[PDB]
Design a binder for this molecule. Sequence first.
Ligand SMILES: [Mn+2]
Ligand SMILES: [Mn+2]
Ligand SMILES: [Mn+2]
Ligand SMILES: [Mn+2]
Lengths: 362, 362
Amino acid sequence: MSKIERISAFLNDKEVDMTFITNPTTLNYLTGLAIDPHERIAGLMIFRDSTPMLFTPALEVEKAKEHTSGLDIFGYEDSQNPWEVVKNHVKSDVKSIAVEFSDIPLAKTEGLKAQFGDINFVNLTPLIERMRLIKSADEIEKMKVAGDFADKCFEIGFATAAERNGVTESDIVAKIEYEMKRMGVPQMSFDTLVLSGARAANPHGAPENVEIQENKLLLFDLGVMSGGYASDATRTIAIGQPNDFDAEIHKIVKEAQQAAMDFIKPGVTAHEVDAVARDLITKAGYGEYFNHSLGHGIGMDVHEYPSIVAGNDLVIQEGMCFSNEPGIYIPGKVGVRIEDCLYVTENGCESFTHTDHDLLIF
Amino acid sequence: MSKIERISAFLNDKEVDMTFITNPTTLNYLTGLAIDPHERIAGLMIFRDSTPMLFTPALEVEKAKEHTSGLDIFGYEDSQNPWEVVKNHVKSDVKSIAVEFSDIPLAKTEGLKAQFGDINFVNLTPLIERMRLIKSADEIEKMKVAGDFADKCFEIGFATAAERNGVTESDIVAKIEYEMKRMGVPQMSFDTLVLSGARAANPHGAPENVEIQENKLLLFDLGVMSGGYASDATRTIAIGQPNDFDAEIHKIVKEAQQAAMDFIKPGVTAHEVDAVARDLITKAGYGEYFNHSLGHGIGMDVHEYPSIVAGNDLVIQEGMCFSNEPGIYIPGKVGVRIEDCLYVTENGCESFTHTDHDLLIF
Ligand SMILES: [Mn+2]
Ligand SMILES: [Mn+2]
Ligand SMILES: [Mn+2]
Ligand SMILES: [Mn+2]
C-alpha cells in the first residue's frame, strides 16, 4: 500500500477536496520531514487526483526538497499572507478540507476560510491514528535504536548510583541525559525519573536533588527519541541489600510483567493482556496499589495506541507497539515498576529493551 | 495593572461574555501557575462581571489553588466530558467566547460549541500579544536571571572546546546543558547550537558528532528558561588562530551588533533598528549573506514580538524586550552570528548578556 494514497483514497471516500496537515509528527510520519515551524505556517496538501503539495516557511523550503518525496513543495516569505500564497498555488477550487482537529489552530483554520470561503472541515486524525497504529519494519528498526539507547541509559544510571558518595537523584538524571546528548540524542521522550525508596511509590513524584537511600530500591523510568521514534522503559533496582518486603514486591511486579510478556500474541485482547498482569498482582494482595493501565502504545510519541486497559477489547495484531509496565506503589514504603515496550510479531512479541528485570544489587 | 482585570476590561468593551484561554504560556503569564495539560483540557475563564474560573484536569486542581492568585478552580475526571463539566459550571449566559486563535485547536472550539450552541468566537490573541509586548520591572528581573545563566553557559562552553582532545560539537552541548541541569535549569530555551567552522554558515545546522575543527570559528547559540522567562544569546569565538578573513567577519558582525546596541532607544522604529545593523553590513560587502531579521521579541517565549525586520515601522517604546543577532554566513567558508537580547530602558537600553563579544582565541 501507499500511505499518501490511503489518505487520497479517504479524500475520495469522503468527498473532501484536499488536506491541510499541520501536525509536525504527522508530516514526519507522512513524508520524512523533521520540521518545527513554531509560530510560522506549514501544511501538507494531499489531493483526490493531483500531485501532493508541501507548504513550508521559505527558509525551510529546500531542506524539504532534501527529504524529497515527490511532493511539489513551495514556501512563503515572512511578509506575504501565507494563506493568500496558498490560495494561489492551489489551482481551484476547494470546499472541503481534512485537518487534524487535534492540532490545527483556529487562526490557520481561519486563514484558509478567508481565501477559500465557507468550507467544511473533516477530521483526518482518526485515519492518521489508524495508520500509525501498525508499525512497518522500518518503523520497528528505528524504535529498536531508541530502545538500545534506553538500555545504555540503564547501565549508566545503575553504575552512577552504585558510586554513592552523596549522589542525588538529580545527579543520576543528568549523568544519564549527558551521555545520551553526547551520543547525538536530540532529547529524551519524557522527563527522566530516578525515584529512590518510598518516593518511587508516588507516581506523581519526579527526581529532586535528594540523596539516594541506602538499603532501599531505586526506580528508573527513561526513554530516548531516536529518528523521530520513541522508547519508554522502567527498571527498579536495589541500592544495597533490599529488605525482604520490597524484595517480594519486586518479585510480584516482575513475574507479572513477565507473564503478560509470555501472553502477548496476535489474537489476544488488550483487556486480556491487562488482565494477566493485573490478575496475578491482585491475587498477591496488591491490586489496590496498581491503579494505572498496564500499558500504552508507543511509536513517534511516547503515548499512542493501542491502550492496554481493562475496558478495551481490541484484538492485538501484528505490528502494534505498546508498553507492558505493571506496578505496585505502596505510599511511604516502596514503588516498583518494570516497563518494557514491545512489538507484536507474527507469532508473539519482541521487546525494544533487554536490560535484566531482576532485583540487582548495587 | 491587574491582568485578569485587563481582560475583563476587554470582554466588556467588546461585549463578549466569557473567555476560554488555552495557551499554557498565556496561563502562566496571567496566573503565574505553570500548568500544561498536554491533551487534557485546561482553560482560563473570565467574565464581564463575575469571578474568574480556571478549569484544569483533576490531577491538577490541587496546585492551581496553592501556587495561584486565588480564583475559582475546578477540574474534571477522565470519566466526564470536559466541556460538559465546563458548561455545568457557567450558570448564565454565553453567546460569545474570546479565545486564542493562535492556539485553540479546532477540537476544543467544537467541544465548546457542543455545550454552548452556535457561539461567536472572538480573538483574544492580539491583546495578550501586546500585554506581553511591554515587560514589567520584575519581569525584566526574571529575564536577567535567564541572561545570567546564558553568560555562564558561554563560559562553561568555551572551556570545553579549548580542551581539544577530539571533542565534538555535541561534546560542548551536553556539557553545557549538564551544568545548567545541576544549577536548577532543567530546560534550555531552545536547541543549543555549537557549530564549528563552515557548518556555522548553515542556518539549519545542529551540533553533530564531529570534531572541533582546529583554526576555524566556533559558534555558540544558547539560551535558557528560568522562572518562566527565557534568554537567547550567540557568541562565536576562534579555535586557535583564525584566518583573519574569517576574523574580518567577526570584526564586522561584532561592530554591527554593537552599532545597534548604541542606537536603540524609545522612539525609533523596528525598521530603523534593523536598518542601522543591516547597512553597517551591506557597507562591508557581505550584504546578501545576512539571511534573516536582526532580532526577535523575547519574554516568556524566546520568539514573540516585536519582529526586528525591515518591513515593520513599529515605534519602539520603553519595556520592550527583543533580540539583536546580526550575522554573516558564507556557505562552505564561515558563519558568524553575535546576538544579544535587551530590554528598552527609559532612554537607551541594557542587555541581558554581558559576555565579551570580541573575538576570543582558545
Ligand atoms: Mn510508559
Ligand atoms: Mn515509562
Ligand atoms: Mn539565538
Ligand atoms: Mn535569537
